[PDB]
């Protein structure tokens, strides 16, 4: 957490969110938790809400020690959209672009994230 490997790892994840996932066109509705004022039934239907701001807060708190836990929350954003909006909703297509560019960027950074993950895991000993 305070160690530089965790901080460097969190920094890379935050940059994927801000530079790539939040840059997806029309992605604003995913940037923050759903507003109940405009979507009144949302929290009755979706039991485990997730959004990009919540992911960034988790990164800031160093919640993620590897990409598997990060991806679990990223994929939950899409899972909720399929359930709430439907599999062919414009909003679900946006969520899929967000998820897709996240995976693509992780791949571009693989060798580097792999090293940080290994060292973070090593230090947990």
Numbering used by the authors: 1520 to 1644
Task: Please give the exact wording used by the authors of the publication that reports this structure.
Bromodomains (BRDs) are protein interaction modules that specifically recognize ε-N-lysine acetylation motifs, a key event in the reading process of epigenetic marks. The 61 BRDs in the human genome cluster into eight families based on structure/sequence similarity. Despite large sequence variations, all BRD modules share a conserved fold that comprises a left-handed bundle of four α helices (αZ, αA, αB, αC), linked by loop regions of variable length (ZA and BC loops), which line the Kac binding site and determine binding specificity. The four helices form a deep cavity that is extended by the two loop regions (ZA and BC loops), creating a largely hydrophobic Kac binding pocket.
Insertions x6 are present in the C-terminal BRDs of TAF1 and TAF1L and possibly PRKCBP1.
